[PDB]
């Protein structure tokens, strides 16, 4: 079967991270949309204009709003992208055939929206040469960050080629997790986000979303299906692109 995949990058990244996977999915006959989120990739906004993870998700919400009735998509989120999935599913949960989490946060409906991010920061407290700043938006102080190049090299793109790592150095931008805003956000709903089918894809060789964290997430909120990819690194859509495509084909064949 063919699906319409909507690929959703993590914070400080852009659609460009999916530059290998997108053509491969298309070569399998799928429609693929790879979005830049607010203040990401070639989006014209700067992060200091963005006050929440919800506002950050605008391009995804807008895209879903523009789907004609009856058209469903499979959302694929990497790393912090699982939060954008949760947000989208609580607005457009009739449009979502399934969501695939790709070394991603997996929010739940029983704890506050910041819950898995708070846990991530316990398990991986040291972001190496990553720099931080503060800005104010909508009366709240928000912590912005710029991922450090050594963190990028060693922990996110560990096994990626120099030309891929170079793209990350060139294209990664200031971003934010909006952790304090998430902490005060209404919980994700059981009827929207809770109802969607959730496929959890991971590698135990991920050097930032470490096994303790990913296995903790799986036990905390049981996915409908789990796929464990052998080897690779955190950016499986670069290091294990063919394997990710294979998994996504199976998802397309399973959930509609």
For residue 42 the two structure tokens come to: 């070639």
User: Minimum distance between the CB of residue 44 and a second copy, rounded to whole angstroms?
Assistant: 6
CA-based nearest residue to 75, from 235, 223, 83, 29: 83
Size of the site for a second copy (CB under 8 A): 21
Of positions 130, 180, 189, 195, contacts Cl ion by CB under 5 A: 189
User: Minimum distance between the CB of residue 81 and a second copy, rounded to whole angstroms?
Assistant: 16
User: Minimum distance between the CB of residue 128 and a second copy, rounded to whole angstroms?
Assistant: 20
Nearer to Cl ion, 77 or 194 (CB): 194
- What H or E segment, with its residue span, contains residue 160? none
By CB under 5 A, tell whether 195 contacts Cl ion. Answer: no
Q: Phi and psi (nearest 5°) for 214?
A: -65, -35
Q: Helix %, strand %, coil % for the chain, to 5?
A: 40, 20, 40
235 is in an annotated binding site: yes
For residue 244 the two structure tokens come to: 């990710």
Give the integer Cα–Cα distance in Å for 77 and 81: 4
Site for a second copy in 150-169 (CB under 8 A): 162-163, 165-167
Give the integer Cα–Cα distance in Å for 97 and 75: 8
Contact positions toward a second copy, by CB under 8 A?
14-16, 19-20, 22-23, 27, 34, 41-42, 44, 46, 162-163, 165-167, 170-171, 173
Known binding positions for acetone: 10, 79
């Amino acid at each position: 079967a063919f699906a319409h995949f909507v690929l959703i990058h993590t914070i400080c990244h852009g659609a460009w991270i999916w530059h290998k996977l997108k053509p491969l999915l298309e070569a399998l006959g799928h429609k693929v949309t790879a979005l830049d989120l607010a203040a990401s990739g070639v989006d014209p906004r700067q992060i200091e204009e963005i006050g929440s993870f919800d506002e950050y998700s605008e391009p995804l919400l807008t895209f879903l709003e523009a789907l004609p009735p009856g058209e469903k998509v499979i959302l694929v989120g990497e790393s912090c992208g699982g939060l954008n999935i949760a947000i989208a599913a609580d607005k457009y949960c009739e449009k979502i055939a399934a969501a695939v989490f790709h070394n991603s946060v997996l929010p739940d409906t029983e704890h506050c929206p910041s819950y898995v991010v708070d846990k991530l920061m316990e398990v991986f407290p040291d972001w190496k040469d990553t720099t931080y700043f503060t800005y104010t938006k909508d009366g709240k102080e928000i912590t912005g960050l710029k991922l450090g190049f050594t963190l990028l090299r060693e922990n996110l793109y560990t096994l990626c080629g120099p030309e891929e790592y170079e793209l990350a150095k060139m294209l990664t931008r200031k971003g934010s997790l909006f952790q304090n805003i998430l902490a005060k956000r209404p919980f994700f709903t059981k009827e929207g986000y809770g109802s969607i089918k959730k496929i959890y894809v991971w590698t135990d060789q991920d050097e930032i979303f470490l096994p303790e964290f990913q296995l903790w997430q799986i036990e905390n909120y049981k996915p409908d299906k789990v796929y464990k990819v052998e080897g690779g690194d955190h950016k499986l859509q670069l290091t294990k692109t063919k394997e990710i495509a294979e998994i996504l084909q199976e998802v397309a064949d399973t959930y509609n």
